């Protein structure tokens, strides 16, 4: 049977307080489902909120520690953070997904395109192999792209190179958001198929994005995770 590799990109902005349980259930259902149709696979996951610059986050010293409300705790924002590299032992994946915590942010759209670019380009560090690759992207908000960074004083276009240090993105303040063409080119080169597990409200916009990115699918994120699971099954069964 065909081997498969899957990576789970989780959004952790503050708008995910109502969707964290669904994301965790989706992780623990992807693992226990794909460990039944392939028998030879590796998965890992990551997280992202937004760039750490003047406009996108609150720069006051008090809010850097707790970007959320004073009642909740929350963790300080981070542009991207690869938490678990690809591995086959499911207990590690379940335990690491079950301990994730939410983080704060100011503006409604989230900068997941930096995370997608880093996942696509940083090959050895994540653990990509010469095998069919899958990338599931969960989000409750919109997305930035090239041209937004000029608000924050960032003008250098994202060069598309790997800049991962200590399993964390460190050049967020230095490079602009990647344009849609850059993501299309990088994903088409790396042979990675993207499945967006977005919330129902953002179904239209992402669906339009599905037209731009070849070989991509969009499902819905909820307690009934069956849609994206069936999308994974369809993608797997269509290989030749």
């Amino acid at each position: 049977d065909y081997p498969i590799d899957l990576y789970y990109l989780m959004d952790l902005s503050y708008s995910m307080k109502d969707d964290l349980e669904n994301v965790k259930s989706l992780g623990t259902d992807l693992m226990n489902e794909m460990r039944r149709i392939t028998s030879d696979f590796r998965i890992g996951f990551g997280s992202f909120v937004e760039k750490t610059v003047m406009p996108y986050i609150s720069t006051t010293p008090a809010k850097l520690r707790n970007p959320c409300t004073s009642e909740q705790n929350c963790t300080s924002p981070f542009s991207y953070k690869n938490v678990l590299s690809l591995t086959n032992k499911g207990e590690v994946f379940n335990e690491l997904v079950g301990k994730q915590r939410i983080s704060g942010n100011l503006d409604s759209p989230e900068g997941g395109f930096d995370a997608i670019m880093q996942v696509a380009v940083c090959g050895s560090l994540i653990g990509w192999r010469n095998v069919t690759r899958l990338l599931v992207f969960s989000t409750d908000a919109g997305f930035h792209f090239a041209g937004d960074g000029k608000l924050g004083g960032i003008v250098l276009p994202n060069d598309g190179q790997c800049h991962l240090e200590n399993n964390m993105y460190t050049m967020s303040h230095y490079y602009d958001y990647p344009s849609i063409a850059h993501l299309v080119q990088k994903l088409s080169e790396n042979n990675i198929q993207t499945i967006f597990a977005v919330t129902e409200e953002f179904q239209p916009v992402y669906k339009e994005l599905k037209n731009l990115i070849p070989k991509s699918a969009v499902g819905t994120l909820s307690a009934n995770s069956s849609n994206v699971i069936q999308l994974i099954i369809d993608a797997y069964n269509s290989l030749s």
């Binding site: 902005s13 503050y14 708008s15 959320c68 409300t69 009642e71 909740q72 704060g104 100011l106 503006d107």
Partner: protein, 61 residues
């Protein structure tokens, strides 16, 4: 009247709670997209609603 926006990167599950609490004391409520507004309540009621809105992290005008 009190305008409680809550339109940033915050959960919709908090804003909805507000509409519950406002409905708990039996008074007005008007909802626009990702916004709620309650008309002409009282003095103590306005204090209470402002306190709850602050506690749930919404920006109240």
């Amino acid at each position: 009247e009190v305008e409680v926006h809550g339109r940033g990167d915050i959960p919709r599950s908090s804003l909805e709670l507000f509409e519950k609490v406002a409905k708990e004391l039996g008074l007005k409520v008007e909802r626009n997209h990702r916004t709620v507004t309650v008309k002409g309540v009282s003095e103590e009621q306005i204090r209470e609603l402002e306190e709850v809105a602050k506690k749930l992290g919404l920006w109240v005008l």
